mmCIF file of C-alpha atoms and ligand atoms in Angstrom:
data_model
loop_
_atom_site.group_PDB
_atom_site.id
_atom_site.type_symbol
_atom_site.label_atom_id
_atom_site.label_comp_id
_atom_site.label_asym_id
_atom_site.label_seq_id
_atom_site.Cartn_x
_atom_site.Cartn_y
_atom_site.Cartn_z
ATOM 1 C CA UNK Z 1 62.324 48.108 -83.987
ATOM 2 C CA UNK Z 2 64.718 47.190 -87.078
ATOM 3 C CA UNK Z 3 67.617 47.925 -84.389
ATOM 4 C CA UNK Z 4 67.153 44.631 -82.601
ATOM 5 C CA UNK Z 5 70.007 41.965 -82.306
ATOM 6 C CA UNK Z 6 69.761 38.441 -82.093
ATOM 7 C CA UNK Z 7 71.989 37.460 -78.672
ATOM 8 C CA UNK Z 8 72.569 33.796 -80.262
ATOM 9 C CA UNK Z 9 75.246 35.503 -82.653
ATOM 10 C CA UNK Z 10 76.867 37.162 -79.247
ATOM 11 C CA UNK Z 11 79.780 35.433 -77.481
ATOM 12 C CA UNK Z 12 80.852 36.729 -73.924
ATOM 13 C CA UNK Z 13 84.357 37.164 -72.884
ATOM 14 C CA UNK Z 14 85.162 39.323 -69.652
ATOM 15 C CA UNK Z 15 83.193 41.347 -67.509
ATOM 16 C CA UNK Z 16 84.614 44.994 -67.743
ATOM 17 C CA UNK Z 17 82.743 46.218 -64.498
ATOM 18 C CA UNK Z 18 79.441 47.521 -62.864
ATOM 19 C CA UNK Z 19 78.483 51.243 -63.594
ATOM 20 C CA UNK Z 20 75.552 53.275 -63.990
ATOM 21 C CA UNK Z 21 72.392 51.597 -65.398
ATOM 22 C CA UNK Z 22 73.719 48.274 -65.380
ATOM 23 C CA UNK Z 23 76.779 45.731 -65.920
ATOM 24 C CA UNK Z 24 79.168 46.120 -68.834
ATOM 25 C CA UNK Z 25 80.506 42.934 -70.348
ATOM 26 C CA UNK Z 26 83.271 42.709 -73.033
ATOM 27 C CA UNK Z 27 81.916 40.230 -76.010
ATOM 28 C CA UNK Z 28 82.436 39.413 -79.755
ATOM 29 C CA UNK Z 29 79.325 39.364 -82.067
ATOM 30 C CA UNK Z 30 79.383 36.953 -85.174
ATOM 31 C CA UNK Z 31 83.001 35.720 -83.575
ATOM 32 C CA UNK Z 32 85.119 38.608 -85.063
ATOM 33 C CA UNK Z 33 83.673 41.951 -84.249
ATOM 34 C CA UNK Z 34 84.646 43.657 -80.885
ATOM 35 C CA UNK Z 35 81.570 44.648 -78.635
ATOM 36 C CA UNK Z 36 80.584 46.089 -75.593
ATOM 37 C CA UNK Z 37 77.431 44.673 -73.780
ATOM 38 C CA UNK Z 38 75.653 47.188 -71.308
ATOM 39 C CA UNK Z 39 73.382 44.700 -69.580
ATOM 40 C CA UNK Z 40 70.510 47.444 -68.153
ATOM 41 C CA UNK Z 41 69.463 46.064 -64.666
ATOM 42 C CA UNK Z 42 65.863 45.320 -64.206
ATOM 43 C CA UNK Z 43 63.902 48.630 -63.141
ATOM 44 C CA UNK Z 44 67.059 50.860 -62.841
ATOM 45 C CA UNK Z 45 65.906 53.021 -65.734
ATOM 46 C CA UNK Z 46 62.202 53.903 -67.082
ATOM 47 C CA UNK Z 47 60.580 51.362 -69.574
ATOM 48 C CA UNK Z 48 58.897 54.222 -71.423
ATOM 49 C CA UNK Z 49 62.097 56.357 -71.097
ATOM 50 C CA UNK Z 50 64.241 53.487 -72.807
ATOM 51 C CA UNK Z 51 61.912 54.193 -76.047
ATOM 52 C CA UNK Z 52 63.306 57.636 -76.714
ATOM 53 C CA UNK Z 53 66.838 56.908 -75.299
ATOM 54 C CA UNK Z 54 67.458 54.418 -77.756
ATOM 55 C CA UNK Z 55 65.748 55.977 -80.928
ATOM 56 C CA UNK Z 56 67.755 59.364 -80.264
ATOM 57 C CA UNK Z 57 71.015 57.616 -80.076
ATOM 58 C CA UNK Z 58 70.332 55.224 -82.972
ATOM 59 C CA UNK Z 59 70.042 58.036 -85.796
ATOM 60 C CA UNK Z 60 73.366 59.505 -84.564
ATOM 61 C CA UNK Z 61 76.811 58.741 -85.648
ATOM 62 C CA UNK Z 62 80.440 60.422 -85.361
ATOM 63 C CA UNK Z 63 84.032 59.568 -85.611
ATOM 64 C CA UNK Z 64 84.638 60.639 -82.175
ATOM 65 C CA UNK Z 65 81.155 59.361 -80.448
ATOM 66 C CA UNK Z 66 80.839 55.704 -78.765
ATOM 67 C CA UNK Z 67 78.617 54.336 -81.643
ATOM 68 C CA UNK Z 68 75.506 52.284 -80.519
ATOM 69 C CA UNK Z 69 75.109 48.815 -82.499
ATOM 70 C CA UNK Z 70 71.614 48.111 -81.198
ATOM 71 C CA UNK Z 71 69.469 46.638 -78.469
ATOM 72 C CA UNK Z 72 67.999 43.253 -77.438
ATOM 73 C CA UNK Z 73 64.557 44.006 -76.015
ATOM 74 C CA UNK Z 74 62.784 40.508 -76.452
ATOM 75 C CA UNK Z 75 64.226 39.260 -73.016
ATOM 76 C CA UNK Z 76 65.021 40.580 -69.417
ATOM 77 C CA UNK Z 77 67.566 42.080 -68.941
ATOM 78 C CA UNK Z 78 67.454 44.475 -71.865
ATOM 79 C CA UNK Z 79 70.882 44.636 -73.636
ATOM 80 C CA UNK Z 80 72.604 47.627 -75.248
ATOM 81 C CA UNK Z 81 75.171 46.719 -77.489
ATOM 82 C CA UNK Z 82 77.887 49.357 -78.676
ATOM 83 C CA UNK Z 83 81.381 50.037 -79.874
ATOM 84 C CA UNK Z 84 83.941 48.311 -77.648
ATOM 85 C CA UNK Z 85 86.760 50.980 -75.864
ATOM 86 C CA UNK Z 86 89.413 48.791 -74.521
ATOM 87 C CA UNK Z 87 90.841 51.367 -71.782
ATOM 88 C CA UNK Z 88 87.229 52.161 -70.564
ATOM 89 C CA UNK Z 89 86.463 55.425 -68.527
ATOM 90 C CA UNK Z 90 88.574 58.410 -69.274
ATOM 91 C CA UNK Z 91 88.700 59.348 -65.463
ATOM 92 C CA UNK Z 92 90.361 55.828 -64.830
ATOM 93 C CA UNK Z 93 92.564 56.248 -67.873
ATOM 94 C CA UNK Z 94 94.069 59.743 -66.599
ATOM 95 C CA UNK Z 95 94.171 58.683 -62.864
ATOM 96 C CA UNK Z 96 96.692 55.775 -63.898
ATOM 97 C CA UNK Z 97 100.084 57.876 -64.035
ATOM 98 C CA UNK Z 98 101.631 54.624 -65.357
ATOM 99 C CA UNK Z 99 101.171 56.215 -68.902
ATOM 100 C CA UNK Z 100 103.329 59.356 -68.198
ATOM 101 C CA UNK Z 101 100.941 61.758 -70.471
ATOM 102 C CA UNK Z 102 102.564 64.575 -72.323
ATOM 103 C CA UNK Z 103 100.837 68.153 -72.500
ATOM 104 C CA UNK Z 104 100.705 67.486 -76.466
ATOM 105 C CA UNK Z 105 98.706 64.155 -75.589
ATOM 106 C CA UNK Z 106 96.532 65.951 -73.355
ATOM 107 C CA UNK Z 107 95.696 68.775 -75.723
ATOM 108 C CA UNK Z 108 94.712 65.820 -78.089
ATOM 109 C CA UNK Z 109 92.010 64.336 -75.784
ATOM 110 C CA UNK Z 110 90.486 67.650 -75.689
ATOM 111 C CA UNK Z 111 90.510 67.903 -79.519
ATOM 112 C CA UNK Z 112 88.715 64.549 -79.580
ATOM 113 C CA UNK Z 113 86.051 65.561 -77.088
ATOM 114 C CA UNK Z 114 85.388 68.941 -78.722
ATOM 115 C CA UNK Z 115 85.316 67.335 -82.370
ATOM 116 C CA UNK Z 116 82.693 64.858 -80.799
ATOM 117 C CA UNK Z 117 80.484 67.729 -78.995
ATOM 118 C CA UNK Z 118 80.387 70.008 -82.279
ATOM 119 C CA UNK Z 119 78.719 67.043 -83.951
ATOM 120 C CA UNK Z 120 75.937 67.099 -81.068
ATOM 121 C CA UNK Z 121 75.942 70.976 -81.439
ATOM 122 C CA UNK Z 122 74.947 70.869 -84.905
ATOM 123 C CA UNK Z 123 72.244 67.753 -84.054
ATOM 124 C CA UNK Z 124 70.883 70.326 -81.441
ATOM 125 C CA UNK Z 125 71.521 67.364 -79.074
ATOM 126 C CA UNK Z 126 72.363 68.593 -75.319
ATOM 127 C CA UNK Z 127 74.598 65.827 -73.452
ATOM 128 C CA UNK Z 128 72.845 67.509 -70.070
ATOM 129 C CA UNK Z 129 75.919 65.822 -68.171
ATOM 130 C CA UNK Z 130 79.513 66.299 -69.841
ATOM 131 C CA UNK Z 131 82.534 64.974 -67.552
ATOM 132 C CA UNK Z 132 85.409 62.460 -67.598
ATOM 133 C CA UNK Z 133 83.062 59.958 -65.919
ATOM 134 C CA UNK Z 134 80.924 59.712 -69.131
ATOM 135 C CA UNK Z 135 83.850 59.592 -71.575
ATOM 136 C CA UNK Z 136 85.380 56.355 -72.953
ATOM 137 C CA UNK Z 137 88.853 55.705 -74.243
ATOM 138 C CA UNK Z 138 89.872 52.810 -76.899
ATOM 139 C CA UNK Z 139 93.172 51.195 -77.399
ATOM 140 C CA UNK Z 140 94.786 53.873 -79.671
ATOM 141 C CA UNK Z 141 94.017 56.290 -76.939
ATOM 142 C CA UNK Z 142 91.521 58.024 -78.736
ATOM 143 C CA UNK Z 143 88.859 59.675 -76.441
ATOM 144 C CA UNK Z 144 84.945 59.431 -77.367
ATOM 145 C CA UNK Z 145 81.825 60.574 -75.717
ATOM 146 C CA UNK Z 146 78.959 58.238 -74.478
ATOM 147 C CA UNK Z 147 75.925 58.055 -71.871
ATOM 148 C CA UNK Z 148 74.467 61.217 -73.896
ATOM 149 C CA UNK Z 149 70.847 62.327 -72.958
ATOM 150 C CA UNK Z 150 71.038 59.612 -70.215
ATOM 151 C CA UNK Z 151 70.738 62.565 -67.653
ATOM 152 C CA UNK Z 152 67.063 62.654 -68.220
ATOM 153 C CA UNK Z 153 66.470 58.875 -67.447
ATOM 154 C CA UNK Z 154 66.517 56.617 -64.490
ATOM 155 C CA UNK Z 155 74.480 62.843 -56.685
ATOM 156 C CA UNK Z 156 73.547 65.743 -59.207
ATOM 157 C CA UNK Z 157 76.790 66.785 -61.204
ATOM 158 C CA UNK Z 158 77.086 70.277 -59.419
ATOM 159 C CA UNK Z 159 81.000 70.660 -60.056
ATOM 160 C CA UNK Z 160 80.071 70.541 -64.168
ATOM 161 C CA UNK Z 161 76.893 72.784 -63.630
ATOM 162 C CA UNK Z 162 76.919 76.401 -64.894
ATOM 163 C CA UNK Z 163 75.397 79.156 -62.750
ATOM 164 C CA UNK Z 164 71.971 78.940 -64.871
ATOM 165 C CA UNK Z 165 71.524 75.555 -64.227
ATOM 166 C CA UNK Z 166 72.421 75.784 -60.405
ATOM 167 C CA UNK Z 167 70.074 78.831 -59.795
ATOM 168 C CA UNK Z 168 67.467 78.327 -62.408
ATOM 169 C CA UNK Z 169 67.841 74.845 -63.976
ATOM 170 C CA UNK Z 170 68.128 76.384 -67.517
ATOM 171 C CA UNK Z 171 69.728 73.788 -69.769
ATOM 172 C CA UNK Z 172 71.332 75.303 -73.228
ATOM 173 C CA UNK Z 173 73.708 74.702 -75.650
ATOM 174 C CA UNK Z 174 76.418 76.749 -73.620
ATOM 175 C CA UNK Z 175 75.489 74.450 -70.518
ATOM 176 C CA UNK Z 176 77.486 71.586 -72.152
ATOM 177 C CA UNK Z 177 80.395 74.343 -72.981
ATOM 178 C CA UNK Z 178 80.731 75.157 -69.199
ATOM 179 C CA UNK Z 179 80.765 71.314 -68.822
ATOM 180 C CA UNK Z 180 83.633 71.066 -71.409
ATOM 181 C CA UNK Z 181 85.594 73.410 -69.666
ATOM 182 C CA UNK Z 182 85.438 71.630 -66.198
ATOM 183 C CA UNK Z 183 86.344 68.395 -68.370
ATOM 184 C CA UNK Z 184 89.400 70.099 -70.098
ATOM 185 C CA UNK Z 185 90.329 70.897 -66.373
ATOM 186 C CA UNK Z 186 89.771 67.136 -65.407
ATOM 187 C CA UNK Z 187 91.980 66.034 -68.236
ATOM 188 C CA UNK Z 188 95.080 68.445 -67.215
ATOM 189 C CA UNK Z 189 94.473 67.908 -63.609
ATOM 190 C CA UNK Z 190 94.708 64.246 -64.236
ATOM 191 C CA UNK Z 191 91.302 62.790 -63.010
ATOM 192 C CA UNK Z 192 91.351 65.096 -59.999
ATOM 193 C CA UNK Z 193 88.215 66.247 -58.526
ATOM 194 C CA UNK Z 194 86.991 69.775 -59.331
ATOM 195 C CA UNK Z 195 86.269 71.885 -56.234
ATOM 196 C CA UNK Z 196 87.831 68.944 -53.992
ATOM 197 C CA UNK Z 197 88.109 71.296 -50.863
ATOM 198 C CA UNK Z 198 84.362 72.250 -51.246
ATOM 199 C CA UNK Z 199 81.472 70.082 -50.880
ATOM 200 C CA UNK Z 200 78.424 70.088 -53.314
ATOM 201 C CA UNK Z 201 76.341 72.673 -51.667
ATOM 202 C CA UNK Z 202 79.136 75.109 -50.769
ATOM 203 C CA UNK Z 203 80.287 74.459 -54.608
ATOM 204 C CA UNK Z 204 76.794 75.880 -56.058
ATOM 205 C CA UNK Z 205 77.429 78.796 -53.647
ATOM 206 C CA UNK Z 206 81.005 79.738 -54.674
ATOM 207 C CA UNK Z 207 80.401 79.328 -58.320
ATOM 208 C CA UNK Z 208 77.675 82.055 -57.982
ATOM 209 C CA UNK Z 209 80.351 84.366 -56.281
ATOM 210 C CA UNK Z 210 82.601 84.051 -59.115
ATOM 211 C CA UNK Z 211 85.210 81.325 -58.220
ATOM 212 C CA UNK Z 212 86.788 79.420 -61.115
ATOM 213 C CA UNK Z 213 88.875 76.444 -61.348
ATOM 214 C CA UNK Z 214 92.816 77.328 -61.015
ATOM 215 C CA UNK Z 215 95.093 76.682 -63.704
ATOM 216 C CA UNK Z 216 96.515 72.859 -63.427
ATOM 217 C CA UNK Z 217 100.345 72.611 -63.306
ATOM 218 C CA UNK Z 218 100.056 70.985 -66.814
ATOM 219 C CA UNK Z 219 98.131 73.399 -68.872
ATOM 220 C CA UNK Z 220 99.766 76.647 -70.183
ATOM 221 C CA UNK Z 221 98.417 80.072 -70.006
ATOM 222 C CA UNK Z 222 96.806 79.631 -73.566
ATOM 223 C CA UNK Z 223 95.256 76.231 -72.771
ATOM 224 C CA UNK Z 224 94.132 77.815 -69.665
ATOM 225 C CA UNK Z 225 92.561 80.868 -71.482
ATOM 226 C CA UNK Z 226 90.604 78.115 -73.638
ATOM 227 C CA UNK Z 227 89.096 76.315 -70.623
ATOM 228 C CA UNK Z 228 88.698 79.745 -68.833
ATOM 229 C CA UNK Z 229 86.432 81.226 -72.097
ATOM 230 C CA UNK Z 230 83.934 78.328 -71.004
ATOM 231 C CA UNK Z 231 83.417 79.809 -67.822
ATOM 232 C CA UNK Z 232 81.675 83.092 -68.550
ATOM 233 C CA UNK Z 233 79.017 84.191 -66.028
ATOM 234 C CA UNK Z 234 76.640 85.195 -69.107
ATOM 235 C CA UNK Z 235 76.109 82.283 -71.316
ATOM 236 C CA UNK Z 236 75.885 84.626 -74.083
ATOM 237 C CA UNK Z 237 79.658 85.418 -74.039
ATOM 238 C CA UNK Z 238 80.552 81.687 -73.725
ATOM 239 C CA UNK Z 239 82.050 80.172 -77.251
ATOM 240 C CA UNK Z 240 80.738 77.201 -79.466
ATOM 241 C CA UNK Z 241 82.334 73.838 -79.880
ATOM 242 C CA UNK Z 242 83.221 75.288 -83.454
ATOM 243 C CA UNK Z 243 85.049 77.971 -81.921
ATOM 244 C CA UNK Z 244 86.487 75.850 -79.011
ATOM 245 C CA UNK Z 245 88.128 73.441 -81.480
ATOM 246 C CA UNK Z 246 89.300 76.269 -83.504
ATOM 247 C CA UNK Z 247 91.236 77.735 -80.727
ATOM 248 C CA UNK Z 248 92.513 73.746 -79.960
ATOM 249 C CA UNK Z 249 93.900 73.240 -83.282
ATOM 250 C CA UNK Z 250 95.355 76.990 -83.365
ATOM 251 C CA UNK Z 251 97.294 76.184 -79.627
ATOM 252 C CA UNK Z 252 97.979 72.635 -81.268
ATOM 253 C CA UNK Z 253 100.304 74.193 -84.133
ATOM 254 C CA UNK Z 254 101.945 76.703 -81.420
ATOM 255 C CA UNK T 1 92.165 26.664 -81.222
ATOM 256 C CA UNK T 2 94.186 29.074 -83.457
ATOM 257 C CA UNK T 3 93.042 32.821 -84.197
ATOM 258 C CA UNK T 4 94.692 33.586 -87.490
ATOM 259 C CA UNK T 5 94.827 30.864 -90.170
ATOM 260 C CA UNK T 6 97.466 32.725 -92.237
ATOM 261 C CA UNK T 7 100.045 32.983 -89.722
ATOM 262 C CA UNK T 8 100.249 29.366 -88.196
ATOM 263 C CA UNK T 9 104.070 28.877 -89.800
ATOM 264 C CA UNK T 10 107.319 30.840 -88.561
ATOM 265 C CA UNK T 11 108.329 31.408 -92.531
ATOM 266 C CA UNK T 12 104.641 33.017 -93.008
ATOM 267 C CA UNK T 13 104.928 35.180 -89.993
ATOM 268 C CA UNK T 14 108.167 36.557 -90.984
ATOM 269 C CA UNK T 15 106.802 37.533 -94.516
ATOM 270 C CA UNK T 16 104.547 40.257 -92.517
ATOM 271 C CA UNK T 17 107.864 42.023 -91.349
ATOM 272 C CA UNK T 18 108.714 43.231 -94.832
ATOM 273 C CA UNK T 19 108.257 46.849 -94.029
ATOM 274 C CA UNK T 20 108.650 46.444 -90.057
ATOM 275 C CA UNK T 21 110.441 49.795 -88.658
ATOM 276 C CA UNK T 22 114.174 49.313 -88.497
ATOM 277 C CA UNK T 23 113.834 51.732 -85.591
ATOM 278 C CA UNK T 24 112.249 49.649 -82.987
ATOM 279 C CA UNK T 25 114.908 47.724 -80.777
ATOM 280 C CA UNK T 26 113.148 44.409 -81.169
ATOM 281 C CA UNK T 27 114.395 41.784 -83.824
ATOM 282 C CA UNK T 28 111.440 40.091 -85.963
ATOM 283 C CA UNK T 29 112.985 36.899 -86.029
ATOM 284 C CA UNK T 30 112.648 36.834 -82.152
ATOM 285 C CA UNK T 31 108.886 37.876 -82.652
ATOM 286 C CA UNK T 32 108.095 35.400 -85.377
ATOM 287 C CA UNK T 33 109.525 32.503 -83.235
ATOM 288 C CA UNK T 34 106.959 33.667 -80.198
ATOM 289 C CA UNK T 35 104.106 33.629 -82.755
ATOM 290 C CA UNK T 36 103.763 37.110 -83.463
ATOM 291 C CA UNK T 37 103.398 38.630 -86.996
ATOM 292 C CA UNK T 38 103.212 42.446 -87.869
ATOM 293 C CA UNK T 39 99.923 44.167 -88.074
ATOM 294 C CA UNK T 40 101.206 46.959 -90.268
ATOM 295 C CA UNK T 41 100.545 50.002 -88.035
ATOM 296 C CA UNK T 42 104.027 51.116 -86.471
ATOM 297 C CA UNK T 43 104.937 48.310 -84.144
ATOM 298 C CA UNK T 44 101.793 46.624 -83.477
ATOM 299 C CA UNK T 45 101.889 42.690 -83.444
ATOM 300 C CA UNK T 46 99.224 40.101 -82.813
ATOM 301 C CA UNK T 47 99.392 36.432 -82.053
ATOM 302 C CA UNK T 48 98.422 33.732 -84.484
ATOM 303 C CA UNK T 49 97.126 31.824 -81.515
ATOM 304 C CA UNK T 50 95.695 33.860 -78.765
ATOM 305 C CA UNK T 51 95.202 37.114 -81.035
ATOM 306 C CA UNK T 52 97.678 38.574 -78.542
ATOM 307 C CA UNK T 53 98.061 42.514 -79.551
ATOM 308 C CA UNK T 54 101.466 43.950 -78.339
ATOM 309 C CA UNK T 55 102.881 47.302 -79.124
ATOM 310 C CA UNK T 56 105.484 49.923 -77.739
ATOM 311 C CA UNK T 57 108.278 47.631 -77.991
ATOM 312 C CA UNK T 58 111.197 48.762 -75.863
ATOM 313 C CA UNK T 59 115.024 47.386 -75.665
ATOM 314 C CA UNK T 60 115.714 44.886 -73.510
ATOM 315 C CA UNK T 61 112.422 42.759 -74.120
ATOM 316 C CA UNK T 62 111.827 39.414 -74.694
ATOM 317 C CA UNK T 63 108.859 38.416 -76.878
ATOM 318 C CA UNK T 64 108.259 35.071 -74.968
ATOM 319 C CA UNK T 65 108.547 36.832 -71.625
ATOM 320 C CA UNK T 66 105.719 39.514 -72.964
ATOM 321 C CA UNK T 67 103.639 36.641 -74.085
ATOM 322 C CA UNK T 68 103.609 35.061 -70.650
ATOM 323 C CA UNK T 69 103.324 38.223 -68.724
ATOM 324 C CA UNK T 70 100.281 39.510 -70.811
ATOM 325 C CA UNK T 71 98.790 36.192 -72.107
ATOM 326 C CA UNK T 72 99.559 33.291 -69.865
ATOM 327 C CA UNK T 73 96.383 31.406 -71.268
ATOM 328 C CA UNK T 74 98.146 31.220 -74.786
ATOM 329 C CA UNK T 75 98.006 27.483 -75.983
ATOM 330 C CA UNK T 76 100.942 27.972 -78.197
ATOM 331 C CA UNK T 77 102.908 29.559 -75.461
ATOM 332 C CA UNK T 78 102.464 26.698 -73.092
ATOM 333 C CA UNK T 79 103.424 24.440 -75.865
ATOM 334 C CA UNK T 80 106.695 25.950 -76.637
ATOM 335 C CA UNK T 81 108.097 27.497 -73.542
ATOM 336 C CA UNK T 82 106.222 25.266 -71.095
ATOM 337 C CA UNK T 83 103.894 25.728 -68.364
ATOM 338 C CA UNK T 84 106.882 25.924 -65.483
ATOM 339 C CA UNK T 85 108.027 28.966 -67.492
ATOM 340 C CA UNK T 86 104.687 30.542 -68.068
ATOM 341 C CA UNK T 87 103.915 30.428 -64.118
ATOM 342 C CA UNK T 88 107.425 31.658 -63.190
ATOM 343 C CA UNK T 89 106.722 34.909 -65.439
ATOM 344 C CA UNK T 90 103.353 35.258 -64.172
ATOM 345 C CA UNK T 91 104.639 34.820 -60.564
ATOM 346 C CA UNK T 92 106.148 38.152 -60.234
HETATM 347 ZN ZN1 ZN E 1 99.526 33.760 -78.303
#
């Protein structure tokens, strides 16, 4: 326990929509602090798995991470109180062209994801599923990472999976690197589907044959080399988020 | 009810625009009459009644037309400009 929150202090305001695991509702805890309430649908996730999921997400905090404020276990459904991100899902934020994003702004989003991923890298934490779908954006435009570790609980992200995860199902720190590369493409292609013309079965086969995502019209040669370095056939030659952020900040001042 | 106690009066709302940017093409007198006060960050203004935040102020803007388009449920807005106005702005 010790992270349990009394829902008597919570005040619901707007239903943000239904997603994975449950419904997300915007509220105000103690009448002044903005909170996001994830209502875990009865029997959607494993009860025993909800023990490890919460515990690992609690003792983890970063500037660019969606902070978990706690749980509400003493009632059904079980609530997950977290940091409220106004703009919601990054994928929808990118897909809305009513923002008119600049190349410098899209590169700043990549910096935000990389900064958070470097923290999970040091903590030996694997996201096991990194994409725009599992990334949130606040009112200020800052992109943060969420739904981490949740892949091992409760179709498969084939398009974000490296060759070793496809052919042999071997998860490493370099598996998230490949996923970050496909996410870097998602940002520069503005919420476009990776390998759109190919089905999930064709995607797995073509990745093994050496097919890599094309350079989007927005990304320059330098930025495309950053996302391409993530897509090395041999995982040993893929960089780290420390090396990736270094290249991101170097190109930022170029 | 009211969101911010300190900014109930126009004279109090105007005091926040002390370090408001002289770059923005929106006059503070217009914002303060529309229940807005400067937050302190670039062009961020909140409402004292509905806590309605508004930024990225462009030229040819009306703080009342922006108050109705984004926050029609604002009790101060319906009190000042009237429901007939609020419904007309939200009607488009
Ligand atoms: Zn208002």
